[PDB]
Scaffold this active site. Structure first.
Site, short mmCIF file in Angstrom:
data_model
loop_
_atom_site.label_atom_id
_atom_site.label_comp_id
_atom_site.label_asym_id
_atom_site.label_seq_id
_atom_site.Cartn_x
_atom_site.Cartn_y
_atom_site.Cartn_z
N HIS A 19 -16.37 45.99 28.56
CA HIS A 19 -16.29 47.40 28.15
C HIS A 19 -16.06 48.28 29.37
O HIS A 19 -16.67 48.08 30.42
CB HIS A 19 -17.58 47.83 27.45
CG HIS A 19 -17.50 49.20 26.83
ND1 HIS A 19 -16.43 49.62 26.07
CD2 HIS A 19 -18.36 50.24 26.87
CE1 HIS A 19 -16.64 50.86 25.66
NE2 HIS A 19 -17.80 51.26 26.13
N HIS A 31 -16.36 57.19 27.23
CA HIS A 31 -15.92 55.86 26.82
C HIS A 31 -15.66 55.89 25.33
O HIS A 31 -15.98 56.86 24.64
CB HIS A 31 -16.98 54.80 27.16
CG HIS A 31 -18.22 54.91 26.32
ND1 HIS A 31 -18.81 53.83 25.72
CD2 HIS A 31 -18.96 55.99 25.96
CE1 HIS A 31 -19.87 54.22 25.04
NE2 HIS A 31 -19.99 55.53 25.18
N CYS A 91 -9.87 49.28 26.01
CA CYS A 91 -10.84 50.14 26.69
C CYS A 91 -10.41 50.41 28.13
O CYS A 91 -10.49 51.54 28.61
CB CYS A 91 -12.22 49.48 26.66
SG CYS A 91 -13.02 49.56 25.04
#
Length: 103
Positions: A19, A31, A91
């Site tokens: 992540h 995020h 991501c």
């Protein structure tokens, strides 16, 4: 790990997943999160028990944008949707667009 600078890319080492997030200060990162939605959350809470590191992977190829521009764009997206799903690669793409721009 010392406190990152605003705009630094943060790589979070989950089991079986990477992540990514971008540091925006006072312990906060921006995020992606599942409902993908852009969130501003505390890094301690996002990472939990998982290890993480600063990884400005492409600073050798591209200059980061001015810190104030990175932060303005990250903040403008907080609470907004994105049109792709969470994957490690997606991501990383998301935070790279914030630090380096659309190129």
């Amino acid at each position: 790990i010392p406190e990152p600078k605003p705009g630094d890319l943060i790589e979070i080492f989950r089991p079986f997943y990477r992540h990514w997030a971008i540091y925006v200060g006072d312990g906060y990162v921006v995020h992606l999160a599942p409902p993908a939605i852009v969130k501003k959350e505390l890094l301690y809470d996002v990472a939990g028990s998982d290890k993480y590191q600063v990884n400005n992977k492409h600073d050798d190829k591209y200059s980061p944008l001015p810190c104030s521009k990175i932060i303005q764009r990250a903040e403008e997206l907080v609470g907004q949707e994105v049109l792709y799903k969470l994957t490690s690669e997606n991501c990383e793409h998301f935070v790279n667009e914030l630090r380096y721009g659309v190129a």
